[PDB]
Amino acid sequence: STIEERVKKIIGQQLGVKQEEVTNNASFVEDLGADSLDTVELVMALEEEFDTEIPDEEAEKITTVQAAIDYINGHQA
Numbered sequence: 311s312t313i314e315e316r317v318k319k320i321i322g323q324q325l326g327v328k329q330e331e332v333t334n335n336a337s338f339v340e341d342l343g344a345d346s347l348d349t350v351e352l353v354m355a356l357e358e359e360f361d362t363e364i365p366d367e368e369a370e371k372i373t374t375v376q377a378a379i380d381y382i383n384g385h386q387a
Contacts (some may be wrong), residue, residue: 313359313360313379313382316359317378318332318334318375319376320352320359321338321352321375321378323355324342324351324352325338325342325348325351325352326345326347326363331356333376334373334374334375334376336374337374338373340373341373341374349364349366349369349372352369352378353369356378356382358384359382360379360382362385368381
């Protein structure tokens, strides 16, 4: 669906990066660098995309992007 294909973007923009280096198994946080506009942003995005205030507690599990997908999918599957 148009959830993941967009997720990458969210992380590709939110975190602030290009639209190519975005994969489905990269700890953007440490891997790349998301210690400011990581969740604080991703949340809103991933939130606007549907509705799920991804809490840091659970955000630490979405360090990457895929998790952010399997997460939004693990809710409405």
